[PDB]
Amino acid sequence: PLQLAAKMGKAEILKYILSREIKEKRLRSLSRKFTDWAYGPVSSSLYDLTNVDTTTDNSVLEITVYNTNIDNRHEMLTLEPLHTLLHMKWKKFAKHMFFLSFCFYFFYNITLTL
Amino acid sequence: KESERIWRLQRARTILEFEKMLPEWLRSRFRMGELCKVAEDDFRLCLRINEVKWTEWKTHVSFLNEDPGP
Amino acid sequence: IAALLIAAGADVNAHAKGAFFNPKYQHEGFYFGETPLALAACTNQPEIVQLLMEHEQTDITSRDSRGNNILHALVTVAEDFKTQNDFVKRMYDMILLRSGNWELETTRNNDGLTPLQLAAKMGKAEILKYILSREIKEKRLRSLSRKFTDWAYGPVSSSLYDLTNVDTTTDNSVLEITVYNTNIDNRHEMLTLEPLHTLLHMKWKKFAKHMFFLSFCFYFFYNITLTLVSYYRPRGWLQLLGRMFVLIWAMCISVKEGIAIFLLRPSDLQSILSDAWFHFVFFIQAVLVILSVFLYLFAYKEYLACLVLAMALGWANMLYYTRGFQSMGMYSVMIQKVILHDVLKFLFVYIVFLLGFGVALASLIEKCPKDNKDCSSYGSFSDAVLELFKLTIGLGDLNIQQNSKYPILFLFLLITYVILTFVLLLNMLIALMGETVENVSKESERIWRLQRARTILEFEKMLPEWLRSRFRMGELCKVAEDDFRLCLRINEVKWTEWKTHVSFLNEDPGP
Amino acid sequence: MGMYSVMIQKVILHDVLKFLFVYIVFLLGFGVALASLIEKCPKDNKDCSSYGSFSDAVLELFKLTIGLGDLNIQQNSKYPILFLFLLITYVILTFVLLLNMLIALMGETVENVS
Numbered sequence: 001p002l003q004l005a006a007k008m009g010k011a012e013i014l015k016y017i018l019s020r021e022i023k024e025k026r027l028r029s030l031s032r033k034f035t036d037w038a039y040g041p042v043s044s045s046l047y048d049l050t051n052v053d054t055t056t057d058n059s060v061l062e063i064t065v066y067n068t069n070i071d072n073r074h075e076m077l078t079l080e081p082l083h084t085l086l087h088m089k090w091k092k093f094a095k096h097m098f099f100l101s102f103c104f105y106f107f108y109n110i111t112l113t114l
Numbered sequence: 115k116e117s118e119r120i121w122r123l124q125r126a127r128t129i130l131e132f133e134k135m136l137p138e139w140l141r142s143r144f145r146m147g148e149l150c151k152v153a154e155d156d157f158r159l160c161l162r163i164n165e166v167k168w169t170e171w172k173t174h175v176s177f178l179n180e181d182p183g184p
Numbered sequence: 185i186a187a188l189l190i191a192a193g194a195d196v197n198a199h200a201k202g203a204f205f206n207p208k209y210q211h212e213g214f215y216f217g218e219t220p221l222a223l224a225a226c227t228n229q230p231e232i233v234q235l236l237m238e239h240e241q242t243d244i245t246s247r248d249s250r251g252n253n254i255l256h257a258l259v260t261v262a263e264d265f266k267t268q269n270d271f272v273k274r275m276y277d278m279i280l281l282r283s284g285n286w287e288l289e290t291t292r293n294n295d296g297l298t299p300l301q302l303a304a305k306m307g308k309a310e311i312l313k314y315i316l317s318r319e320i321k322e323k324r325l326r327s328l329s330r331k332f333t334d335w336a337y338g339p340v341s342s343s344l345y346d347l348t349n350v351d352t353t354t355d356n357s358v359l360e361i362t363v364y365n366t367n368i369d370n371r372h373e374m375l376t377l378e379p380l381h382t383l384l385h386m387k388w389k390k391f392a393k394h395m396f397f398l399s400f401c402f403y404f405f406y407n408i409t410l411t412l413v414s415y416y417r418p419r420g421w422l423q424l425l426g427r428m429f430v431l432i433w434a435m436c437i438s439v440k441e442g443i444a445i446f447l448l449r450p451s452d453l454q455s456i457l458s459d460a461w462f463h464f465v466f467f468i469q470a471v472l473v474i475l476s477v478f479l480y481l482f483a484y485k486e487y488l489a490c491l492v493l494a495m496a497l498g499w500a501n502m503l504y505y506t507r508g509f510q511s512m513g514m515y516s517v518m519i520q521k522v523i524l525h526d527v528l529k530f531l532f533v534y535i536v537f538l539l540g541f542g543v544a545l546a547s548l549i550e551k552c553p554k555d556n557k558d559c560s561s562y563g564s565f566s567d568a569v570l571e572l573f574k575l576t577i578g579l580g581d582l583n584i585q586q587n588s589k590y591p592i593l594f595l596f597l598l599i600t601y602v603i604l605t606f607v608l609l610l611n612m613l614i615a616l617m618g619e620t621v622e623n624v625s626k627e628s629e630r631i632w633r634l635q636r637a638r639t640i641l642e643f644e645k646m647l648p649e650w651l652r653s654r655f656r657m658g659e660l661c662k663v664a665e666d667d668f669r670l671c672l673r674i675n676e677v678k679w680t681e682w683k684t685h686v687s688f689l690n691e692d693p694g695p
Numbered sequence: 696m697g698m699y700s701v702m703i704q705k706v707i708l709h710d711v712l713k714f715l716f717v718y719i720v721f722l723l724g725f726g727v728a729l730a731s732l733i734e735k736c737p738k739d740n741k742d743c744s745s746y747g748s749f750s751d752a753v754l755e756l757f758k759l760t761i762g763l764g765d766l767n768i769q770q771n772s773k774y775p776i777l778f779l780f781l782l783i784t785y786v787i788l789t790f791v792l793l794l795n796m797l798i799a800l801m802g803e804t805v806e807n808v809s
């Protein structure tokens with residue numbers, strides 16, 4: 001149902017499930033977001049990444065990005081775990097890979113022209 | 115106004131394509147840590163996100179760790 | 185629980201000097217003042233604050249490891265109305281009134297800054313607006329006020345604004361901090377306050393107008409005589425004064441820009457050259473004239489290039505003085521935003537297309553036959569690039585009978601370049617800078633005033649130790665028997681209050 | 696036609712005058728800069744360069760701005776690279792920046808006076 005919400009374009013249901021925090025202690029394993037600590041107006045929350053990170057075949061991030069038969073694709077990537085995950089991926093390995101691809105294609109075009 | 119998103123959609127597509135280009139090794143660059151919740155087994159993954167807001171002003175009960183920060 | 189701990193003997197003056205409490209990236213910590221009283225003030229807990237002030241050992245004037253006090257901490261944690269409420273200003277007012285002394289606002293932290301100066305530096309426009317126009321109705325503590333209503337007759341009231349650390353006469357002042365600093369985004373709205381605006385107005389109408397006009401006239405005459413002595417070169421005893429004045433004024437501009445670049449911070453060099461570009465071009469023009477006469481003194485043939493470049497740059501640099509008038513000032517700053525936002529992107533894409541198509545077209549033409557050299561205009565790479573550039577600007581005649589072995593492909597590439605540049609790139613540029621001038625249409629009455637304020641403050645700093653005795657207004661400010669300091673009379677008209685005037689100071693209105 | 700006439704009035708006084716002022720400053724500055732880069736014509740020759748005098752250089756820049764004539768870079772300039780650099784700078788400043796910004800500005804004008 002989480003992957004179905006990602007595929008069908010339901011941004012509100014996906015926003016609820018991804019950031020689902022349950023206050024009561026009788027069933028807290030059903031939560032996906034856990035507040036590690038909150039000191040004043042500063043709180044650190046832990047977001048579960050079971051089927052969200054692109055490491056479990058069909059994941060929420062891959063379904064949200066790669067699929068095309070939706071109109072609200074832009075607003076679904078603005079959620080808390082997906083945005084942050086894309087940021088860290090870009091700042092970890094995607095930046096160097098894109099720069100290397102740019103440099104190799106630029107040199108290939110330059111030497112082909114020459 | 116419809117340019118800060120579509121460009122980010124293209125950027126996300128390039129990020130995911132570049133990650134798929136990585137082999138079975140060298141992909142051991144997961145998000146953050148292992149400890150996620152109070153469950154005794156299979157902690158899975160986690161992702162620390164910090165938020166600042168000066169409007170709630172409520173007592174924190176759903177907190178998990180007594181010591182803030184690292 | 186806090187009351188139970190305090191009544192049992194808790195450490196009120198305890199300092200939470202931990203590393204988490206004093207963050208550096210504002211992402212892993214929360215700074216509140218390193219004091220329980222400062223924490224209660226910053227977390228919108230008024231009852232805890234009032235319970236803490238009246239106590240036998242609470243030190244309101246405590247300074248943490250950063251040198252900050254409770255007013256400094258309230259200034260740092262302050263923000264706009266969107267992110268948080270106005271409780272910080274209310275807490276600032278309550279704590280300042282309960283303390284009932286001027287030692288809280290006159291205490292400098294470990295940065296040489298008062299809480300008023302800290303509010304000016306950090307960009308807190310709401311707190312600065314409260315402090316600058318702080319009027320206290322009660323007579324038990326009225327020396328803590330900064331604005332005093334001299335008189336109010338009907339819907340007309342004359343108020344006196346204190347100018348202790350506001351006017352640019354006490355080294356680091358609120359006006360200089362507000363204008364000269366650059367690491368804020370709300371700089372435009374901070375200069376719209378009551379004392380700062382009026383002070384800038386009177387400074388401009390007193391000495392900055394004549395100084396700007398004199399600088400404009402001197403630079404215009406210098407450029408005119410430089411152009412005249414360079415265009416009328418031999419290729420003159422009475423005409424030697426012009427070139428000597430060119431040399432003297434070029435040296436003066438060179439040393440002025442040199443000393444203005446030497447102390448120039450690397451923070452205003454950020455953004456996109458919106459506050460230091462004219463310094464560089466004036467220095468470049470000055471050293472170009474210097475190098476031109478330097479190579480003219482000896483037998484150097486490469487001296488006219490620097491002189492001609494100096495003429496072109498000098499006549500280009502004359503558009504700086506358009507900021508003196510309002511409408512030309514808007515035109516100049518919109519030139520700035522346009523030429524950096526979308527002219528550069530269009531130039532980058534156009535140059536990529538121009539060089540790619542120029543090197544693609546130059547490869548489709550074979551060598552010229554014997555006794556023939558004008559077979560094709562797209563001969564070399566430079567010739568093809570020049571032909572495409574001439575085609576883009578609408579000059580010349582389109583000739584398709586070149587010496588190309590594949591004329592169909594040559595025409596296809598030519599038409600593709602025509603579409604991509606003339607139909608797509610240039611027209612989209614015209615469409616884009618319409619959006620640009622739409623956004624900067626409203627964001628032009630401020631940035632121009634920021635440039636005007638910078639010129640006013642620079643011109644005032646240019647004045648010597650004398651001749652600066654042109655202070656704002658009068659000496660009498662409040663009822664204090666000693667050290668009346670300065671004042672600034674501002675008249676306001678409003679027909680909505682309709683209240684009895686009690687905080688008035690003088691019974692007789694007017695002069 | 697009354698709306699057209701009063702909008703002619705506002706346009707020709709608001710932003711046509713500013714564009715004319717800036718363009719004339721650039722035109723005269725670049726015209727007197729280009730006319731100084733060309734030496735005197737040799738013997739039995741008078742059509743060496745179209746940018747002969749100050750008036751000739753100003754007329755050539757004005758003809759270039761309106762799209763008339765043919766661009767000739769083989770003038771009698773001792774520094775042809777600097778001559779071409781100044782010519783291209785004038786092309787950018789007028790044809791790319793000034794005129795197109797004028798078209799963009801009078802759109803805002805006819806929007807307000809609409």
Ligand SMILES: CCCCCCCC/C=C/CCCCCCCC(=O)O[C@@H](COC(=O)CCCCCCCCCCCCCCC)COP(=O)([O-])OCC[N+](C)(C)C
Pocket residue numbers: 531534566567569570573576577768775776779780783784786787788790791
């Ligand atoms: C929409 C379109 C508008 C324009 C868009 C841009 C188009 C740009 C495209 C321009 C290309 C135009 C043709 C280039 C010349 C080819 C022929 C030629 O003479 O080659 C010469 C090279 O020529 C140069 O290097 C020219 C000088 C620099 C050109 C770029 C100036 C940019 C100014 C930007 C200023 C800042 C921006 C301004 C605003 C802030 C070779 O030399 P020569 O003369 O053959 O002889 C050699 C000399 N010798 C014999 C002594 C050894």
Ligand SMILES: CCCCCCCC/C=C/CCCCCCCC(=O)O[C@@H](COC(=O)CCCCCCCCCCCCCCC)COP(=O)([O-])OCC[N+](C)(C)C
Pocket residue numbers: 715718750751753754757760761
């Ligand atoms: C985006 C671009 C568009 C245009 C933008 C503006 C560009 C303007 C730029 C124009 C310069 C163009 C070249 C100038 C001529 C050079 C050569 C020449 O003939 O020199 C002549 C000088 O020439 C003049 O003085 C011309 C007349 C005035 C020019 C300005 C008109 C402005 C009208 C504005 C109306 C109001 C506004 C309209 C709307 C309300 C010298 O004379 P001669 O002929 O050589 O012979 C001498 C005579 N004799 C032998 C008898 C002694």
